[PDB]
Amino acid sequence: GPSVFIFPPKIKDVLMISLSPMVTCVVVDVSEDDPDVQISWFVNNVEVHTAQTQTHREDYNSTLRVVSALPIQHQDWMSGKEFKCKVNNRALPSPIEKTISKPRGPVRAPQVYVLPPPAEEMTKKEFSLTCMITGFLPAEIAVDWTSNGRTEQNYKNTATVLDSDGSYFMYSKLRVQKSTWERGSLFACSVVHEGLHNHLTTKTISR
Amino acid sequence: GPSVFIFPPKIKDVLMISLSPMVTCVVVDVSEDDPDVQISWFVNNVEVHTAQTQTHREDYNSTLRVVSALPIQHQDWMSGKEFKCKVNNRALPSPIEKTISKPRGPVRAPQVYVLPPPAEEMTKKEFSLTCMITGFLPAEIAVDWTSNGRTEQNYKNTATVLDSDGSYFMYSKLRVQKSTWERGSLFACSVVHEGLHNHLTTKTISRSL
Ligand SMILES: *[C@@H]1O[C@H](CO)[C@@H](O)[C@H](O)[C@H]1NC(C)=O
Ligand SMILES: *[C@@H]1O[C@H](CO)[C@@H](O)[C@H](O)[C@H]1NC(C)=O
Ligand code: NA
Ligand code: NA
Ligand code: NA
Ligand code: NA
Ligand code: NA
Ligand code: NA
C-alpha cells in the first residue's frame, strides 16, 4: 500500500537568503490500479495552494511515485511553523498526514580548524588539507571548499559522527597538487550552520 | 517467506591470531507455524559441524530469527576459500544457500598521520588529537588509540570513505586531557590492516620536551 515520506528543506537553502527552500512530500508504491493521489498542504493548519506536484511512472514494478514540493520562506521554517501534507488515495483506509517542523533545541556553533598537510606527506606530488569541524548542534551542516573564489571539485566530507559529548563532528579532506600549493594559493573551507554569524564561517590556509 | 543473510568476519578478528573470526548466517522471517530450521555449513564444499546456532523469538510478530555463527580458521578466510550455509525449513519451496569469500584484489597499505593540534586548542583543559588515515585498499580496517601503552576509550572514528583514486580514507578523533598531555604522556593511533607488515602500525605524538 502507498507510503508517504516528508523531507525538510536543505540546511543551506534555509540559512541563505538568496536560495529557495522547499518542504517535500513523496508518495511511493502508488498502485497502477488506484493511480489517483490528492495531496493538500497546510502551514499551522491553514490550507495553502502553491505546491508544485509531479508524477513519475515506475512501469517496471507496476507503481507510480508522486512528488509534491512546497516553496517556503526561510523565516517560517526558522520560527518553528508546522508544515503538513495530507495524502488521499482509494487504496488507503484513511488519508495519511505527515508533518514536519524545525525542532526547538540547543544550538552550539562548530569550531572549525583548517590543518596543514603532515610533514611526511610533503614529499609527494599531491596531498591532503583537513578541515576539522567539531562541537556542533544540531547535526545539520554544509561544508565546501574554494580557492580564489572557485569551488574546488576534489574534496570529500566524512559523515557526521555523534561525539560522547552530545555534540557532532566531521572532517572534510581536500586533495591539492603540490604546484598549486607552492604558487601560494589560498584554500578556504566554508561551513554553514545555525550557530554561525550570518550562518557562515570560512577558514583559509596557504603555504 | 524466510530469507537468509551471510556476514563476513570482522577484519581485526581475522588479522590477529589470538582472536576468533566467525562467518555468520542469519535467517529472518521464519514463521512460528514452521519454526524448525536446519543450517548446514561448508568450507570449499566440505561439511563442517563446528557452528553455534541460536533461535531468537520475535513474538510481537509471531516470527523467529535464527543466527548460526561458524568459527573459521584465519588462513581459510585470507586464502579465498568459499564459506557456504544451506538453510532448510518445512515451508521452504526448496533449500536456500548463501556463499561468501574474501575477494582477490589489490592491497594498498594505509598512510597514517597524527596531526599536530592547533595552539589555541592546547591551552584548553580538554582537546582533540586527529589521526588521518589515507590510501588504503581494501576498505576493511580497525583503528584505535593508546595513552602510555594502554588502550584509550575516549575516541571516535569516522566511517571509511571512497577517495577519488580508488583508495579509502578515514579520520579518528581522540579526546585528551591537558593535564595528561602536559605530563608528557605518549599518545598513539594504532591501525590494523592487511597491507601492513605484522598487520599493525602505530603513530605517536606527545608534548614538545
Ligand atoms: C515493488 O512494488 C511493491 C508494491 O506493489 C513494493 O512492496 C516493493 O517494495 C517494490 N519492489 C522494489 C524492489 O522496489
Ligand atoms: C511479521 O511477519 C511477517 C511474516 O509473516 C514478516 O514478513 C514481517 O516482516 C513481520 N514484520 C516485522 C516488522 O517484522
Ligand atoms: Na519549522
Ligand atoms: Na591535512
Ligand atoms: Na599555498
Ligand atoms: Na563451500
Ligand atoms: Na575467503
Ligand atoms: Na585489511
Side-chain angles (χ1 to χ4, degrees), chain B residues 67-104:
Chain B
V67 175
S68 190
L70 178 77
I72 54 166
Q73 298 211 288
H74 303 65
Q75 211 29 64
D76 293 337
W77 186 250
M78 296 307 278
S79 69
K81 286 192 149 56
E82 176 211 78
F83 294 84
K84 169 162 74 192
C85 66
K86 304 188 184 181
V87 172
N88 283 287
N89 181 234
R90 226 154 54 174
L92 278 179
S94 69
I96 297 174
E97 325 193 359
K98 286 279 192 296
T99 286
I100 189 166
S101 57
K102 188 182 191 317
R104 227 184 264 166

Short mmCIF file of all heavy atoms in Angstrom, two decimals, chain B residues 67-104:
data_model
loop_
_atom_site.label_atom_id
_atom_site.label_comp_id
_atom_site.label_asym_id
_atom_site.label_seq_id
_atom_site.Cartn_x
_atom_site.Cartn_y
_atom_site.Cartn_z
N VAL B 67 20.25 -17.39 14.15
CA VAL B 67 21.63 -16.89 13.95
C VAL B 67 22.61 -18.07 14.06
O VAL B 67 22.72 -18.65 15.10
CB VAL B 67 22.04 -15.90 15.02
CG1 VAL B 67 23.53 -15.44 14.92
CG2 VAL B 67 21.08 -14.68 15.02
N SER B 68 23.30 -18.43 12.99
CA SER B 68 24.30 -19.51 13.03
C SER B 68 25.69 -18.93 12.79
O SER B 68 25.91 -18.39 11.74
CB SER B 68 23.97 -20.57 11.96
OG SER B 68 24.79 -21.71 12.16
N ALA B 69 26.58 -18.97 13.77
CA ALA B 69 27.98 -18.45 13.63
C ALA B 69 29.01 -19.58 13.54
O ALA B 69 29.12 -20.34 14.48
CB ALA B 69 28.33 -17.55 14.80
N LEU B 70 29.72 -19.67 12.41
CA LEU B 70 30.75 -20.66 12.15
C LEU B 70 32.14 -20.07 12.53
O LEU B 70 32.53 -19.04 11.93
CB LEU B 70 30.76 -21.04 10.68
CG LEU B 70 31.84 -22.06 10.27
CD1 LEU B 70 31.34 -23.43 10.74
CD2 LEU B 70 32.07 -22.12 8.76
N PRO B 71 32.84 -20.65 13.50
CA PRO B 71 34.21 -20.16 13.89
C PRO B 71 35.16 -20.72 12.80
O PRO B 71 34.99 -21.87 12.41
CB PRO B 71 34.48 -20.79 15.26
CG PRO B 71 33.68 -22.09 15.18
CD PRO B 71 32.42 -21.79 14.33
N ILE B 72 35.92 -19.86 12.17
CA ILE B 72 36.68 -20.24 10.96
C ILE B 72 38.14 -20.14 11.30
O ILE B 72 38.50 -19.45 12.29
CB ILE B 72 36.39 -19.32 9.74
CG1 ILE B 72 36.62 -17.84 10.07
CG2 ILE B 72 34.96 -19.47 9.25
CD1 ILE B 72 36.67 -16.98 8.81
N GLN B 73 38.97 -20.72 10.45
CA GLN B 73 40.39 -20.56 10.56
C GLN B 73 40.84 -19.36 9.75
O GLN B 73 40.40 -19.17 8.62
CB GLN B 73 41.06 -21.80 10.04
CG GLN B 73 40.67 -22.99 10.89
CD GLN B 73 41.79 -23.96 10.91
OE1 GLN B 73 42.04 -24.62 9.89
NE2 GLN B 73 42.55 -24.00 12.02
N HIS B 74 41.79 -18.61 10.30
CA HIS B 74 42.17 -17.31 9.79
C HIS B 74 42.64 -17.46 8.33
O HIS B 74 42.25 -16.66 7.47
CB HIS B 74 43.28 -16.60 10.65
CG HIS B 74 42.92 -16.41 12.11
ND1 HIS B 74 42.72 -17.46 12.98
CD2 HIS B 74 42.73 -15.29 12.84
CE1 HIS B 74 42.41 -17.00 14.17
NE2 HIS B 74 42.40 -15.69 14.11
N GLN B 75 43.43 -18.50 8.07
CA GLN B 75 44.04 -18.70 6.76
C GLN B 75 43.05 -19.10 5.68
O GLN B 75 43.23 -18.76 4.50
CB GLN B 75 45.19 -19.73 6.83
CG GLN B 75 46.35 -19.51 5.82
CD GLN B 75 46.62 -18.03 5.36
OE1 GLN B 75 47.00 -17.15 6.15
NE2 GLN B 75 46.40 -17.76 4.05
N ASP B 76 41.95 -19.74 6.08
CA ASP B 76 40.90 -20.09 5.13
C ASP B 76 40.24 -18.82 4.63
O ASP B 76 39.93 -18.73 3.45
CB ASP B 76 39.82 -21.01 5.72
CG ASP B 76 40.34 -22.41 6.08
OD1 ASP B 76 41.37 -22.89 5.52
OD2 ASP B 76 39.70 -23.02 6.94
N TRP B 77 40.01 -17.85 5.52
CA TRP B 77 39.48 -16.61 5.05
C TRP B 77 40.44 -15.91 4.10
O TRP B 77 40.05 -15.48 2.98
CB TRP B 77 39.10 -15.66 6.17
CG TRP B 77 38.40 -14.44 5.68
CD1 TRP B 77 38.90 -13.19 5.66
CD2 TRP B 77 37.06 -14.34 5.16
NE1 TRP B 77 37.99 -12.32 5.14
CE2 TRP B 77 36.87 -13.00 4.78
CE3 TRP B 77 36.03 -15.24 4.94
CZ2 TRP B 77 35.68 -12.55 4.21
CZ3 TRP B 77 34.85 -14.78 4.35
CH2 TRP B 77 34.68 -13.46 4.01
N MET B 78 41.67 -15.72 4.58
CA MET B 78 42.68 -14.92 3.86
C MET B 78 43.02 -15.52 2.50
O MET B 78 43.18 -14.77 1.55
CB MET B 78 43.95 -14.77 4.73
CG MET B 78 43.76 -13.99 6.04
SD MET B 78 42.99 -12.38 5.75
CE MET B 78 44.48 -11.49 5.25
N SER B 79 43.05 -16.86 2.38
CA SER B 79 43.37 -17.51 1.08
C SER B 79 42.17 -17.61 0.12
O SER B 79 42.31 -18.16 -0.98
CB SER B 79 43.93 -18.91 1.30
OG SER B 79 42.93 -19.77 1.79
N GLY B 80 41.02 -17.06 0.47
CA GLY B 80 39.90 -17.02 -0.52
C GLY B 80 38.98 -18.25 -0.58
O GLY B 80 38.26 -18.41 -1.55
N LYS B 81 38.99 -19.12 0.41
CA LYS B 81 38.07 -20.25 0.42
C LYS B 81 36.58 -19.80 0.54
O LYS B 81 36.30 -18.78 1.20
CB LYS B 81 38.37 -21.17 1.59
CG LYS B 81 39.63 -22.02 1.43
CD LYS B 81 39.62 -23.09 2.54
CE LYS B 81 40.29 -24.39 2.15
NZ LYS B 81 41.65 -24.06 1.71
N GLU B 82 35.67 -20.58 -0.08
CA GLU B 82 34.24 -20.29 -0.10
C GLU B 82 33.56 -20.81 1.18
O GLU B 82 33.65 -22.01 1.52
CB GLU B 82 33.64 -20.92 -1.36
CG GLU B 82 32.11 -20.84 -1.56
CD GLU B 82 31.51 -22.06 -2.37
OE1 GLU B 82 31.29 -23.25 -1.84
OE2 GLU B 82 31.25 -21.81 -3.58
N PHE B 83 32.86 -19.94 1.90
CA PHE B 83 32.07 -20.38 3.07
C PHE B 83 30.62 -20.37 2.67
O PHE B 83 30.17 -19.43 2.02
CB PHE B 83 32.32 -19.49 4.25
CG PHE B 83 33.71 -19.57 4.75
CD1 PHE B 83 34.67 -18.84 4.17
CD2 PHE B 83 34.05 -20.43 5.73
CE1 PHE B 83 35.99 -18.94 4.59
CE2 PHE B 83 35.41 -20.57 6.15
CZ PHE B 83 36.34 -19.80 5.58
N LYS B 84 29.90 -21.42 2.96
CA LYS B 84 28.55 -21.56 2.44
C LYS B 84 27.62 -22.12 3.47
O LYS B 84 27.94 -23.14 4.08
CB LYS B 84 28.56 -22.50 1.22
CG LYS B 84 27.16 -22.94 0.75
CD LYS B 84 27.23 -23.47 -0.68
CE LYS B 84 27.87 -24.85 -0.76
NZ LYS B 84 28.19 -25.21 -2.19
N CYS B 85 26.43 -21.52 3.63
CA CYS B 85 25.43 -22.07 4.53
C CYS B 85 24.25 -22.51 3.69
O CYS B 85 23.88 -21.79 2.77
CB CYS B 85 25.04 -21.10 5.66
SG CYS B 85 24.18 -19.62 5.07
N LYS B 86 23.71 -23.71 3.96
CA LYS B 86 22.46 -24.16 3.33
C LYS B 86 21.39 -24.17 4.40
O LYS B 86 21.60 -24.69 5.51
CB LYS B 86 22.60 -25.57 2.71
CG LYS B 86 23.72 -25.68 1.68
CD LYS B 86 23.71 -27.03 0.91
CE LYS B 86 24.91 -27.10 -0.03
NZ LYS B 86 24.99 -28.33 -0.83
N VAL B 87 20.23 -23.63 4.07
CA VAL B 87 19.16 -23.43 5.06
C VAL B 87 17.95 -24.25 4.62
O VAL B 87 17.48 -24.08 3.51
CB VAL B 87 18.79 -21.94 5.17
CG1 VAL B 87 17.56 -21.74 6.03
CG2 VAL B 87 19.99 -21.10 5.67
N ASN B 88 17.51 -25.14 5.47
CA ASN B 88 16.32 -25.98 5.23
C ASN B 88 15.22 -25.66 6.27
O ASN B 88 15.53 -25.42 7.48
CB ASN B 88 16.67 -27.45 5.36
CG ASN B 88 17.40 -27.98 4.14
OD1 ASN B 88 16.79 -28.17 3.10
ND2 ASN B 88 18.69 -28.19 4.25
N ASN B 89 13.97 -25.60 5.79
CA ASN B 89 12.74 -25.32 6.61
C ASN B 89 11.56 -26.05 5.91
O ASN B 89 11.63 -26.35 4.72
CB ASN B 89 12.50 -23.80 6.73
CG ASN B 89 11.26 -23.39 7.57
OD1 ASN B 89 10.39 -22.64 7.10
ND2 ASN B 89 11.24 -23.79 8.85
N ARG B 90 10.52 -26.34 6.66
CA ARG B 90 9.33 -27.10 6.18
C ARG B 90 8.60 -26.37 5.07
O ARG B 90 8.27 -26.95 4.07
CB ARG B 90 8.36 -27.31 7.35
CG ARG B 90 7.79 -28.69 7.50
CD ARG B 90 7.40 -28.96 8.95
NE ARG B 90 6.49 -27.95 9.51
CZ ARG B 90 5.92 -28.04 10.71
NH1 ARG B 90 6.13 -29.09 11.51
NH2 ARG B 90 5.11 -27.07 11.13
N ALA B 91 8.38 -25.08 5.29
CA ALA B 91 7.68 -24.18 4.38
C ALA B 91 8.49 -23.69 3.20
O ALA B 91 7.97 -22.93 2.39
CB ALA B 91 7.18 -22.97 5.16
N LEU B 92 9.77 -24.06 3.09
CA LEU B 92 10.61 -23.54 2.01
C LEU B 92 10.29 -24.32 0.75
O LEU B 92 10.39 -25.55 0.78
CB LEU B 92 12.13 -23.57 2.35
CG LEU B 92 12.63 -22.40 3.22
CD1 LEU B 92 14.13 -22.51 3.54
CD2 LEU B 92 12.35 -21.05 2.60
N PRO B 93 9.94 -23.62 -0.37
CA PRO B 93 9.81 -24.32 -1.66
C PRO B 93 11.02 -25.20 -1.98
O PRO B 93 10.84 -26.29 -2.52
CB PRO B 93 9.71 -23.18 -2.68
CG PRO B 93 9.39 -21.95 -1.92
CD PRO B 93 9.90 -22.14 -0.53
N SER B 94 12.23 -24.72 -1.63
CA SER B 94 13.47 -25.52 -1.62
C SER B 94 14.56 -24.86 -0.74
O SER B 94 14.42 -23.70 -0.35
CB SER B 94 13.98 -25.72 -3.06
OG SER B 94 14.43 -24.51 -3.61
N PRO B 95 15.65 -25.60 -0.43
CA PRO B 95 16.72 -25.06 0.43
C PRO B 95 17.32 -23.76 -0.14
O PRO B 95 17.41 -23.65 -1.34
CB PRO B 95 17.76 -26.19 0.44
CG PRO B 95 17.04 -27.41 -0.02
CD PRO B 95 16.03 -26.91 -0.99
N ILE B 96 17.64 -22.79 0.72
CA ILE B 96 18.30 -21.54 0.34
C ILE B 96 19.79 -21.69 0.75
O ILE B 96 20.10 -22.17 1.87
CB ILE B 96 17.75 -20.33 1.10
CG1 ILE B 96 16.29 -20.10 0.75
CG2 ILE B 96 18.55 -19.04 0.80
CD1 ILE B 96 15.67 -18.99 1.59
N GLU B 97 20.67 -21.25 -0.15
CA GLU B 97 22.13 -21.29 0.05
C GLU B 97 22.65 -19.87 -0.08
O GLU B 97 22.24 -19.11 -0.99
CB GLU B 97 22.87 -22.22 -0.97
CG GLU B 97 22.03 -23.43 -1.31
CD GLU B 97 22.69 -24.59 -2.04
OE1 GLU B 97 23.91 -24.55 -2.40
OE2 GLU B 97 21.89 -25.55 -2.24
N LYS B 98 23.56 -19.51 0.82
CA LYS B 98 24.34 -18.31 0.66
C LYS B 98 25.82 -18.65 0.80
O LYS B 98 26.20 -19.55 1.58
CB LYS B 98 23.89 -17.26 1.65
CG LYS B 98 22.55 -16.61 1.32
CD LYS B 98 22.77 -15.53 0.27
CE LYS B 98 21.58 -14.62 0.07
NZ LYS B 98 20.43 -15.39 -0.47
N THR B 99 26.61 -17.91 0.04
CA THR B 99 28.04 -18.08 -0.08
C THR B 99 28.78 -16.77 0.15
O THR B 99 28.29 -15.73 -0.24
CB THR B 99 28.32 -18.60 -1.51
OG1 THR B 99 27.91 -19.97 -1.55
CG2 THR B 99 29.71 -18.60 -1.84
N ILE B 100 29.97 -16.82 0.74
CA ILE B 100 30.80 -15.62 0.90
C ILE B 100 32.28 -16.01 0.93
O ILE B 100 32.64 -17.10 1.38
CB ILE B 100 30.44 -14.84 2.19
CG1 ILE B 100 31.12 -13.49 2.25
CG2 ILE B 100 30.81 -15.65 3.43
CD1 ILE B 100 30.54 -12.58 3.32
N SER B 101 33.11 -15.16 0.37
CA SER B 101 34.55 -15.32 0.43
C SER B 101 35.22 -13.97 0.35
O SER B 101 34.61 -12.98 0.00
CB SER B 101 35.07 -16.20 -0.69
OG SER B 101 34.68 -15.68 -1.92
N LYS B 102 36.49 -13.93 0.69
CA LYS B 102 37.33 -12.72 0.58
C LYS B 102 37.70 -12.49 -0.88
O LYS B 102 38.39 -13.35 -1.45
CB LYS B 102 38.59 -12.92 1.40
CG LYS B 102 39.45 -11.70 1.53
CD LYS B 102 40.70 -12.03 2.33
CE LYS B 102 41.48 -10.76 2.72
NZ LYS B 102 41.61 -9.78 1.62
N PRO B 103 37.28 -11.34 -1.49
CA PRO B 103 37.67 -11.13 -2.89
C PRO B 103 39.19 -10.96 -3.05
O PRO B 103 39.86 -10.48 -2.13
CB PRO B 103 36.92 -9.86 -3.31
CG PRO B 103 36.27 -9.30 -2.12
CD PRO B 103 36.52 -10.20 -0.95
N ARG B 104 39.71 -11.45 -4.16
CA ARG B 104 41.10 -11.21 -4.53
C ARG B 104 41.10 -9.78 -5.15
O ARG B 104 40.14 -9.36 -5.75
CB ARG B 104 41.61 -12.30 -5.50
CG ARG B 104 42.98 -12.87 -5.10
CD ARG B 104 43.57 -13.90 -6.10
NE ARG B 104 43.31 -15.30 -5.71
CZ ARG B 104 43.45 -16.38 -6.49
NH1 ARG B 104 43.87 -16.30 -7.74
NH2 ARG B 104 43.15 -17.58 -6.00
#
